[PDB]
Design a protein around this nucleic acid. Sequence first.
RNA 1: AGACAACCUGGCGAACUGAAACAUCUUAGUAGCCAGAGGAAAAGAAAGCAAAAGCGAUUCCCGUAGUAGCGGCGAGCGAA
RNA 2: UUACUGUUCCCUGGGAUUGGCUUUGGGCUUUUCCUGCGCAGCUUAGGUGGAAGGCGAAGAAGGCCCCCUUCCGGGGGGGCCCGAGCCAUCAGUGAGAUACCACUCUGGAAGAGCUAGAAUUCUAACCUUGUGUCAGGACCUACGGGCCAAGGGACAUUCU
Lengths: 227, 76, 147
Amino acid sequence: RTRSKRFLEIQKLREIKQEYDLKTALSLMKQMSSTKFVETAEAHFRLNIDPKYNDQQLRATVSLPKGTGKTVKIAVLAQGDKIDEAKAAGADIVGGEELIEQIKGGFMDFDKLIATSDMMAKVASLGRILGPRGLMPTPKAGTVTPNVAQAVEEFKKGKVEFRVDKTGIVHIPFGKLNFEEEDLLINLFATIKSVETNKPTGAKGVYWKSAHISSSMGPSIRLNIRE
Amino acid sequence: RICPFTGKKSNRANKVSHSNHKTKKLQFVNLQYKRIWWEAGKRYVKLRLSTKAIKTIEKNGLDAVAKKAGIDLSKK
Amino acid sequence: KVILKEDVTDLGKQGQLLDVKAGFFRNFLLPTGKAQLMTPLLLKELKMEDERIEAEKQRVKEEAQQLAMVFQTVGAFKVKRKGGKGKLIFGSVTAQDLVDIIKSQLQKDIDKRLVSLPEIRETGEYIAELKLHPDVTARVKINVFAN
RNA sequence: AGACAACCUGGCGAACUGAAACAUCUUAGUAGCCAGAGGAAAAGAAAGCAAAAGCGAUUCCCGUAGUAGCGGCGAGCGAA
RNA sequence: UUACUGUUCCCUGGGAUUGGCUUUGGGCUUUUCCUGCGCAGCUUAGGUGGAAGGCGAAGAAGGCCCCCUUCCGGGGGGGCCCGAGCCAUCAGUGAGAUACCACUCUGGAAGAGCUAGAAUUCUAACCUUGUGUCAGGACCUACGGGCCAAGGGACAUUCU
């Protein structure tokens, strides 16, 4: 029997001083997501570099053990001989412009769609379904390229592009506060171990000042990158 | 050790020092005498210490404890 | 490290527990002023001057929050304010017939400075939300019978 | 208080002379001045030394080296 | 003695007793703004994960005028007259990367502050002399101690 807000509470279950580790900040980050629906878990890292320059900038990708990989049902859609290299690569389902009438019926047993540049003319019409669902392939995501083989096989690992802004802090949602416990560990760990190997040779001294793992709207927490 | 002489109150007397720059010689050094004012707690007494007993004359129960009867107001 | 307590043109009130100026108490603030000396000996003593000022949140609040509990299942308040004029009334109600009614049955008395703005003159159910302190609130009902 | 014979603790503190010159240094932290106490004082059972072997209070005597070390590494002094 | 090596005295500066405000002027921790539009994309995206529901007590169109970045071809923000209500994002288009919703730096300024220096004021010492009151019976020209008050004012002096 007691009335509370939405800050004082969470602010009590966390500490700024103590340096919570990966395993510790695990059963804590989930307790800080007492919000509607599924909240996303991010991770802010303070890099000691110079944003004004480019040689100091960091740009790469991290392979998240969970969220992506084989669990995903990527569907390949191309023509010509690009259809053969799709099945031999290891895709869930492959087909030409014939399956276009299938998705219109209600078949959406997929999460990742990729196609060439010689079919986008018709795929563009699906901007009403695949468009909003972000299922439509885009050049940026690299989902649109003649080398569909290296594409479908690439998503089989799953990556998350990341860079440095005018400040010098990097952050990429390694998942949500709904996933398991052991999962949120390998993802966060892989995120660091990956970005670390992308440090500029021009960097001098400590490359990391402090690491944090916050969510959509809630207090932060200093995470130990070493562990 | 013992602070030089310029009065009393607590310390003793002179304790000359020396040099070592380019030669050793007995230098007649002095002390950071100075004094302190204290009214509340007793009667006005200008104890001229040596900036090293200020924490043992007005801090502890050296006199801070305003006592009525007893030996002369002065430390003696 | 001292205890200001008596805030006087100084950055700090009720004694400062954080780094403060120096050489400003060795012969002024301390003597014939505000007994500071924030030492482990006066620290525990200082608390006994504030902790007893916080207890009112776990004690005084208790002996004031039960107001909504003690008064909630009480019988219906039958107070006739002279209902006539065809439909209106004669008696006047501003705060008296809003708190004095508590004594109307089984003794008990309450202050009149605990009621909100009066209610329109009628004979229906009244909603006298008893408001003691800005921390706890209660609810009181009032009715009128044509005499 | 003995205007205290020496020994002892403490404060302060030279020069002549030696360095075949002399201001570093040495010669003396002696002599000398002053204060206090004992008949012994002082010191004393050890945040020591050594060492991974172990000893293990202080003080005194004989050695360990008057070697090592220190120094216009000159004079000279001098460990553990 | 304008020989050498030291020293007393006479002086200068820092650190201490000297601490508390204000004004002007730097810097640091950086708060809030302003140039990382070359080109294409008509609109300035400095960016990732959203990639699709959410937002309803921290700056969301024009005629007319100024400043702030470039009223200074067109934009954003503060306002007087004119002046619809739920919004934005998006496929296509399309650069290497595009601005809404949830979080984020420099060079150079203003503000909130920390700190190193000048210039003012008062006061809590300190220095000092000075009406007077006091340690009385000190019916003596005097050091010293104390109260009160005045003056200077925490800039000497003292110590290293």
